[PDB]
Enzyme design. Structure first.
Site, PDB file in Angstrom:
ATOM      1  CB  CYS A 132      -1.043   0.014   1.094  1.00 56.09           C
ATOM      2  SG  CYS A 132      -2.282  -1.235   0.752  1.00 56.09           S
ATOM      3  CD  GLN A 133       5.632   3.736   3.042  1.00 55.29           C
ATOM      4  OE1 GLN A 133       6.131   2.670   3.372  1.00 55.29           O
ATOM      5  NE2 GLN A 133       6.064   4.883   3.509  1.00 55.29           N
ATOM      6  CE1 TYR A 264       9.817   0.796  -2.354  1.00 55.88           C
ATOM      7  CE2 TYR A 264       7.856  -0.519  -2.680  1.00 55.88           C
ATOM      8  CZ  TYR A 264       8.517   0.638  -2.858  1.00 55.88           C
ATOM      9  OH  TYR A 264       7.868   1.639  -3.513  1.00 55.88           O
ATOM     10  N   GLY A 265      13.209  -3.804  -0.302  1.00 58.77           N
ATOM     11  CA  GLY A 265      13.971  -4.595   0.637  1.00 58.77           C
ATOM     12  C   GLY A 265      13.109  -4.977   1.835  1.00 58.77           C
ATOM     13  CG  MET A 267       5.804  -2.375   3.554  1.00 61.49           C
ATOM     14  SD  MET A 267       5.980  -0.615   3.344  1.00 61.49           S
ATOM     15  CE  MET A 267       4.954  -0.158   4.749  1.00 61.49           C
ATOM     16  CD  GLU A 268       7.561   1.247   7.063  1.00 59.58           C
ATOM     17  OE1 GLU A 268       8.140   0.608   6.165  1.00 59.58           O
ATOM     18  OE2 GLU A 268       7.433   2.489   7.021  1.00 59.58           O
ATOM     19  CG  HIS A 292      15.061   0.851   7.739  1.00 66.45           C
ATOM     20  ND1 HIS A 292      15.645   2.076   7.502  1.00 66.45           N
ATOM     21  CD2 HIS A 292      13.817   0.928   7.214  1.00 66.45           C
ATOM     22  CE1 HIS A 292      14.796   2.861   6.864  1.00 66.45           C
ATOM     23  NE2 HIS A 292      13.674   2.193   6.691  1.00 66.45           N
ATOM     24  CD  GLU A 293      11.668  -1.958   6.536  1.00 62.66           C
ATOM     25  OE1 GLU A 293      10.962  -1.025   6.964  1.00 62.66           O
ATOM     26  OE2 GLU A 293      12.283  -1.838   5.442  1.00 62.66           O
ATOM     27  CG  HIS A 296       9.614   2.240   9.528  1.00 57.31           C
ATOM     28  ND1 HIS A 296       9.516   3.611   9.374  1.00 57.31           N
ATOM     29  CD2 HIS A 296      10.283   1.788   8.434  1.00 57.31           C
ATOM     30  CE1 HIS A 296      10.118   3.971   8.254  1.00 57.31           C
ATOM     31  NE2 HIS A 296      10.577   2.882   7.657  1.00 57.31           N
ATOM     32  CD  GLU A 315      11.405   5.422   4.995  1.00 52.76           C
ATOM     33  OE1 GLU A 315      12.232   4.815   5.734  1.00 52.76           O
ATOM     34  OE2 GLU A 315      10.346   4.900   4.617  1.00 52.76           O
ATOM     35  CG  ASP A 372       4.922   4.274  -6.572  1.00 55.54           C
ATOM     36  OD1 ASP A 372       5.548   3.942  -5.554  1.00 55.54           O
ATOM     37  OD2 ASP A 372       3.720   3.931  -6.835  1.00 55.54           O
ATOM     38  CE1 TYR A 380      13.791   6.003   1.282  1.00 58.40           C
ATOM     39  CE2 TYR A 380      14.232   4.593   3.160  1.00 58.40           C
ATOM     40  CZ  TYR A 380      13.458   4.914   2.074  1.00 58.40           C
ATOM     41  OH  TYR A 380      12.368   4.113   1.780  1.00 58.40           O
TER      42      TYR A 380
HETATM   43  C1  LIG Z   1      17.111  -0.227   5.306  1.00 52.31           C
HETATM   44  C2  LIG Z   1      16.027   0.432   4.455  1.00 52.31           C
HETATM   45  C3  LIG Z   1      16.697   1.513   3.606  1.00 52.31           C
HETATM   46  C4  LIG Z   1      15.335  -0.620   3.570  1.00 52.31           C
HETATM   47  C5  LIG Z   1      14.333  -0.075   2.531  1.00 52.31           C
HETATM   48  N1  LIG Z   1      12.980  -0.174   3.096  1.00 52.31           N
HETATM   49  C6  LIG Z   1      12.323   0.912   3.481  1.00 52.31           C
HETATM   50  O1  LIG Z   1      12.845   2.018   3.368  1.00 52.31           O
HETATM   51  C7  LIG Z   1      10.937   0.720   4.034  1.00 52.31           C
HETATM   52  O2  LIG Z   1      10.934   0.959   5.440  1.00 52.31           O
HETATM   53  C8  LIG Z   1       9.977   1.658   3.293  1.00 52.31           C
HETATM   54  N2  LIG Z   1       8.710   1.843   4.001  1.00 52.31           N
HETATM   55  C9  LIG Z   1       9.735   1.108   1.893  1.00 52.31           C
HETATM   56  C10 LIG Z   1       8.784   1.934   1.036  1.00 52.31           C
HETATM   57  C11 LIG Z   1       8.832   3.324   0.950  1.00 52.31           C
HETATM   58  C12 LIG Z   1       7.939   4.046   0.125  1.00 52.31           C
HETATM   59  C13 LIG Z   1       6.972   3.401  -0.645  1.00 52.31           C
HETATM   60  C14 LIG Z   1       6.919   2.025  -0.559  1.00 52.31           C
HETATM   61  C15 LIG Z   1       7.819   1.297   0.265  1.00 52.31           C
HETATM   62  C16 LIG Z   1      14.363  -0.845   1.229  1.00 52.31           C
HETATM   63  O3  LIG Z   1      15.436  -0.919   0.601  1.00 52.31           O
HETATM   64  O4  LIG Z   1      13.307  -1.404   0.819  1.00 52.31           O
HETATM   65  F1  LIG Z   2       6.896   8.944  -1.953  1.00 51.98           F
HETATM   66  C1  LIG Z   2       7.696   9.938  -1.536  1.00 51.98           C
HETATM   67  C2  LIG Z   2       7.394  10.511  -0.309  1.00 51.98           C
HETATM   68  C3  LIG Z   2       8.160  11.547   0.229  1.00 51.98           C
HETATM   69  C4  LIG Z   2       9.233  12.020  -0.499  1.00 51.98           C
HETATM   70  N1  LIG Z   2      10.145  13.004  -0.284  1.00 51.98           N
HETATM   71  C5  LIG Z   2      11.029  13.053  -1.335  1.00 51.98           C
HETATM   72  C6  LIG Z   2      10.695  12.096  -2.299  1.00 51.98           C
HETATM   73  C7  LIG Z   2       9.542  11.462  -1.737  1.00 51.98           C
HETATM   74  C8  LIG Z   2       8.789  10.405  -2.273  1.00 51.98           C
HETATM   75 ZN   LIG Z   3      11.838   2.844   5.817  1.00 52.14          ZN
END
Ligand SMILES: CC(C)C[C@H](NC(=O)[C@@H](O)[C@H](N)Cc1ccccc1)C(=O)O
Ligand SMILES: Fc1ccc2[nH]ccc2c1
Ligand SMILES: [Zn+2]
Ligand SMILES: [Yb+3]
Ligand SMILES: [Yb+3]
Ligand SMILES: [Yb+3]
Length: 607
Positions: A132-133, A264-265, A267-268, A292-293, A296, A315, A372, A380
């Site tokens: 969903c994110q 993704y790597g 998703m929390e 990381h997860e 969250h 993030e 997206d 991050y």
């Molecule tokens: C250690 C982290 C950098 C790992 C990273 N995962 C994340 O950042 C998750 O917590 C994020 N919630 C993944 C995400 C962000 C935006 C839209 C959809 C999914 C990833 O690489 O998937």
């Molecule tokens: F989906 C997202 C949400 C927050 C953000 N801030 C910078 C890029 C970006 C993308």
């Molecule tokens: Zn994250």
């Protein structure tokens, strides 16, 4: 005001609860069912409300047991289509009604991927998972699709009996489906309010193994053993995160290992983190993703960004906690190594976008932008670098963690903005405002490009990587002889990875050099996905034909976007592999994760 949502905003009405009853149909790739929203008005004399949907078929809408008037507006692109519901009786401020909506999803739902039996490990059963994110929950159920609103939920899900359902909630029993004994109903309760982007569902041939007091690992049968090993540090990571952020309020912390197309790597999702199978290195080396997860569970799932403009709050704080967990576990020098690595990812993203690009701003304006499409490392690592810079400014880690812990208590169960965060930082450090006023807020929060200040990093573990990378870049042909397998003798997997990241930043290198690198380091054999990914990249940008099939193979046998997108992009920029890259995408596109499909399409300039 949330510019990614079409729904009535929180100042008008707020969803308190979702009861979801639905049935999964693998033959039609649809979810069909009802979503009962318990909705509280925030205004006098409210007569209609607006919800987000996307490719949803609405059958009817029932309030107080009667069908009621509603309409779908014109599709607005990636936002979907607003649903306007006409209330049968005007509501006063604070009044609650329950609105039951009958709906069905499209097979092309941007939230879902339906897998064929061949696409799984077992080969006998299909499989479904959601993501969903950020704003794909509207492609599963009509909802106010904005993180500015928090709701509890309960769900009952009918699935073919030989399969299992799991959700982002506490699993609360199973029984035969009385409407059809070819099926099971599984039930779930999420008693802690959440933004809807944390709703998650998987349905598939799953088993579980216990790996600690409050964690089971789940995946297909053939991944379970390796997954229990790989993620064995999980409880110890929860213990440190509790110590840093306060009590873990969610009951269970489980892990689900997905099939290799998970975008993704990690998703929390509450109660049930989703991770990619590309984390299974054999040696736990990629566990920073679990940390990381886990993090969250405080920063993100408790304190949540009010709109996606403020994603960095989510993030940045999480990477800050991820790095602390890792530092407690393996030493402070390892935290510094990983932090400097992150700044390296930061330089890459900014170089890629261009230093004046609006997506390089910490706070971004998302009007008209598909999130997206805007996604990168910037929030991050720029976010992380801000917190790390504030840490050094305000007197070290222990002091800054006292702020982190207080920030969580403060904003728990809320949704906040960058100004909510800043304000509390000024309040918490009132005795140090003079130092706080020397920060260039307008540059850090709102200007594009690299941050104006670079924090201080211990170099201990980093030096051997920069040094070995400098030898290769400055080597001429007559220096190639002197590289040997023993150069790698004292480097951890993490330093091998950092060696390649250094080297990749100066890519291309001469084809000769790369061939010699493989000759003496045998990187082709290494199955660690981070390492292999960067080594394949360095190969393709340095134009080594032999790496073509190795790169195609990795880009398609898994689909974690981090790897799959730049592999396809690189391959396309290499003249020799350009056609095969475009062709392979077109051959695999239909059976890809629909978000991955779309982004790779854009990247390749295709369709
Ligand atoms: C250690 C982290 C950098 C790992 C990273 N995962 C994340 O950042 C998750 O917590 C994020 N919630 C993944 C995400 C962000 C935006 C839209 C959809 C999914 C990833 O690489 O998937
Ligand atoms: F989906 C997202 C949400 C927050 C953000 N801030 C910078 C890029 C970006 C993308
Ligand atoms: Zn994250
Ligand atoms: Yb129960
Ligand atoms: Yb203030
Ligand atoms: Yb020479």
């Amino acid at each position: 005001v949330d510019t990614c949502s079409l729904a009535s905003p929180a100042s008008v009405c707020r969803t308190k609860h979702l009861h979801l009853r639905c049935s999964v149909d693998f033959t039609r790739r649809t979810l069909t069912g009802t979503a009962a929203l318990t909705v509280q008005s925030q205004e006098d004399n409210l007569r209609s409300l607006v919800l987000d949907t996307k490719d949803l078929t609405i059958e009817k809408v029932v309030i107080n047991g009667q069908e009621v008037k509603y309409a779908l507006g014109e599709r607005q692109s990636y936002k979907g289509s607003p649903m306007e519901i006409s209330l049968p009786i005007a509501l006063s401020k604070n009044q609650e009604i329950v609105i039951e909506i009958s709906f069905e999803t499209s097979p092309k739902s941007s939230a879902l991927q339906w897998l064929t039996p061949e696409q799984t490990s077992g080969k006998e059963h299909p499989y479904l998972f959601s993501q969903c994110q950020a704003i794909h929950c509207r492609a599963i159920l009509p909802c106010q699709d904005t993180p500015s609103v928090k709701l509890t939920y309960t769900a009952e899900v009918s699935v073919p009996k030989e399969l299992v359902a799991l959700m982002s909630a506490i699993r609360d029993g199973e029984t035969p489906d009385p409407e059809d004994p070819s099926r099971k109903i599984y039930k779930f309760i999420q008693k802690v309010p959440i933004p809807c982007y944390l709703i998650a569902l998987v349905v598939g041939a799953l088993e579980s193994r216990q790996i600690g007091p409050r964690t089971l690992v789940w995946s297909e049968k053939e991944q379970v053993e390796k997954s229990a090993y790989e993620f064995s540090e999980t409880e110890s990571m929860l213990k440190i995160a509790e110590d840093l952020g306060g009590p873990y309020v969610w009951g269970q912390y489980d892990l689900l290992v997905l099939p290799p197309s998970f975008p993704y790597g990690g998703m929390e999702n509450p109660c049930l983190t989703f991770v990619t199978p590309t984390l299974l290195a054999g040696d736990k080396s990629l566990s920073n993703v679990i940390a990381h997860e886990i993090s969250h569970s405080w920063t993100g799932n408790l304190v949540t960004n009010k709109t996606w403009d403020h994603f960095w709050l989510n993030e940045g704080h999480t990477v800050y906690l991820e790095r602390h967990i890792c530092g407690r576990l393996f030493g402070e020098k390892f935290r510094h190594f990983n932090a400097l690595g992150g700044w390296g990812e930061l330089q890459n993203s900014v170089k890629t976008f261009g230093e004046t690009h609006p997506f390089t701003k910490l706070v971004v304006d998302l009007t008209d932008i598909d999130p997206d499409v805007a996604y990168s490392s910037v929030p991050y690592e720029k976010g992380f670098a801000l917190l790390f810079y504030l840490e050094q400014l305000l007197g070290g880690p222990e002091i800054f963690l006292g702020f982190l812990k207080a920030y969580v208590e403060k904003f728990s169960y809320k949704s906040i903005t960058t100004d909510d965060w800043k304000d509390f930082l000024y309040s918490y450090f009132k005795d140090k405002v003079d130092v706080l006023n020397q920060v260039d807020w307008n540059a850090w929060l709102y200007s594009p490009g690299l941050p104006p200040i670079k924090p201080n990093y211990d170099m201990t573990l980093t030096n051997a990587c920069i040094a070995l990378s400098q030898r290769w870049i400055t080597a001429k042909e007559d220096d190639l002889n002197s590289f040997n397998a023993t150069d790698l003798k004292d480097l951890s997997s993490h330093q091998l990875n950092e060696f390649l990241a250094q080297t990749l930043q100066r890519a291309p290198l001469p084809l000769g050099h790369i061939k010699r690198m493989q000759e003496v380091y045998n990187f082709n054999a290494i199955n660690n996905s981070e390492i292999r990914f960067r080594w394949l990249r360095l190969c393709i940008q340095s134009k080594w034909e032999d790496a073509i099939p190795l790169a195609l193979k990795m880009a398609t046998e898994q689909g974690r976007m981090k790897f799959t997108r730049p592999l396809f992009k690189d391959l396309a920029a290499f003249d020799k592999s350009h056609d095969q890259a475009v062709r392979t995408y077109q051959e695999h596109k239909a059976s890809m994760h629909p978000v991955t499909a779309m982004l790779v399409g854009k990247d390749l300039k295709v369709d």
